[PDB]
Scaffold this active site. Structure first.
Site, PDB file in Angstrom:
ATOM      1  N   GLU A   1      49.297  79.955  94.946  1.00  0.00           N
ATOM      2  CA  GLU A   1      49.318  79.489  93.624  1.00  0.00           C
ATOM      3  C   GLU A   1      50.575  80.158  92.981  1.00  0.00           C
ATOM      4  O   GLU A   1      50.733  81.445  93.253  1.00  0.00           O
ATOM      5  CB  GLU A   1      48.314  79.520  92.778  1.00  0.00           C
ATOM      6  CG  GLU A   1      47.426  78.210  92.750  1.00  0.00           C
ATOM      7  CD  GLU A   1      46.328  78.079  91.529  1.00  0.00           C
ATOM      8  OE1 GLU A   1      47.114  77.728  90.489  1.00  0.00           O
ATOM      9  OE2 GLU A   1      45.350  78.049  91.704  1.00  0.00           O
TER      10      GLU A   1
ATOM     11  N   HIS B   1      47.904  74.738  93.716  1.00  0.00           N
ATOM     12  CA  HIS B   1      47.021  74.352  92.447  1.00  0.00           C
ATOM     13  C   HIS B   1      46.197  73.252  92.485  1.00  0.00           C
ATOM     14  O   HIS B   1      46.714  72.238  93.026  1.00  0.00           O
ATOM     15  CB  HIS B   1      48.065  74.118  91.586  1.00  0.00           C
ATOM     16  CG  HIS B   1      47.743  74.023  90.318  1.00  0.00           C
ATOM     17  ND1 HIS B   1      47.106  75.320  89.553  1.00  0.00           N
ATOM     18  CD2 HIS B   1      47.586  73.300  89.246  1.00  0.00           C
ATOM     19  CE1 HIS B   1      46.811  74.879  88.253  1.00  0.00           C
ATOM     20  NE2 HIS B   1      46.862  73.767  87.986  1.00  0.00           N
TER      21      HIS B   1
ATOM     22  N   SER C   1      43.501  74.413  85.063  1.00  0.00           N
ATOM     23  CA  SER C   1      45.026  74.480  84.435  1.00  0.00           C
ATOM     24  C   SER C   1      45.149  74.825  83.069  1.00  0.00           C
ATOM     25  O   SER C   1      44.657  75.622  82.754  1.00  0.00           O
ATOM     26  CB  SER C   1      45.707  73.145  85.019  1.00  0.00           C
ATOM     27  OG  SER C   1      46.923  73.249  84.471  1.00  0.00           O
TER      28      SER C   1
END
EC number: 3.1.1.-
Length: 320
Positions: free
Chosen positions: A262, A293, A160
């Protein structure tokens, strides 16, 4: 309202984590019958900011050969997370055991108390700390044990916001700016990298995820980017009008991994293919269908998570 100073102090306490006094060992189940022990302990890498990292050593293969290094930068949208969080600690146990590598999992300053580029500065301090340990025979003091580490085989794995961090390191290393011989980063793994932009992509305008929403991502950028900056800032958009000259810099091989559902899918796909059409850029884009995610760490022992660890391992094996 004072309840506002408290929700700010909540964010600080929530992601403060803890520091282990001595080294510890955990059991990690490999791909509930096959187990593996991983030694780990915390060390300070930036005394002024009191920033700690966690070193992981798979015990079985550490006494067999020299281990490659995996530097793992956790996610959290630049506002959440700690290396000691069980969610991230469990993933690093899996990283060390499955990849047979020494894992470096550092904390980094979090927003809004420390806005960007505070996280990128901390990431460079991690690599500089690794360099200081490499040239000073410091790996022998990493544990109550000898440790043979191949600093010529370093890989950065970013989750991330850590994927964004991994990109900034790849640019700074590839531009000839920072240079840390004998530490040699051979590849970068960008897992759902937190990239941003004022104009929205199709997937960003799509349906919200189990946890992520476009509003949450906007609040992340707004709280972490400097005051008065837009999502087109180079620290958010890799192709914004500030440092888009990636054609000139020599980028290391990269691996971009995202889930098919995502919100950040289209940005990462556009990021990888814009690099694939740049010359001398080996970028592999891997998309796991119908995943959201962080599926690799949110659902361990699932098939998709195990395939990610295999792909990273193969990616490491080919680059060395």
């Amino acid at each position: 309202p004072q309840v506002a100073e408290d929700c700010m102090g909540l964010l600080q306490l929530l992601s403060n984590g803890t520091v282990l006094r001595s080294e510890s060992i955990d059991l990690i189940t490999q791909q509930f019958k096959n187990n593996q022990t991983v030694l780990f302990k915390d060390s300070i890498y930036h005394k002024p900011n009191n920033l700690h990292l966690r070193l992981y050593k798979p015990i079985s293969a550490s006494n067999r050969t020299a281990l490659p290094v995996v530097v793992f930068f956790h996610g959290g949208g630049f506002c959440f997370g700690s290396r000691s969080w069980p969610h991230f600690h469990n993933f690093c146990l899996t990283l060390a055991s499955s990849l047979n590598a020494l894992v470096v999992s550092p904390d980094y300053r979090l927003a809004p108390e420390h806005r960007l580029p505070a996280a990128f500065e901390d990431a460079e301090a991690v690599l500089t700390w690794l360099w200081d340990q490499a040239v000073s025979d410091g790996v022998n003091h990493w544990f109550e044990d000898g440790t043979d580490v191949d600093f010529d085989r370093v890989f950065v794995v970013g989750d991330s916001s850590g994927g964004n961090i991994a990109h900034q390191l790849a640019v700074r290393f590839g531009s000839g700016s920072i240079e840390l011989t004998p530490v040699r980063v051979r590849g970068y793994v960008l897992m759902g990298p937190f990239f941003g932009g004022e104009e929205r992509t199709n997937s960003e305008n799509g349906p919200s995820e189990a946890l992520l929403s476009l509003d949450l991502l906007d609040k992340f950028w707004r709280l972490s980017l400097p005051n008065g900056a837009t999502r087109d800032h180079h620290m958010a958009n890799p192709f914004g009008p500030t440092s888009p000259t990636l054609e000139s810099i020599s980028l290391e091989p990269m691996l971009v991994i995202v889930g098919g559902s995502e919100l950040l899918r289209d940005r990462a796909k556009e990021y990888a293919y814009k690099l694939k059409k740049m010359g001398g850029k080996r970028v592999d884009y891997i998309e796991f269908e119908n995943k959201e995610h962080g599926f690799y760490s949110n659902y361990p022992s699932s098939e998709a998570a195990e395939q990610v660890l295999r792909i990273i391992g193969d990616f490491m094996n080919n680059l060395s």
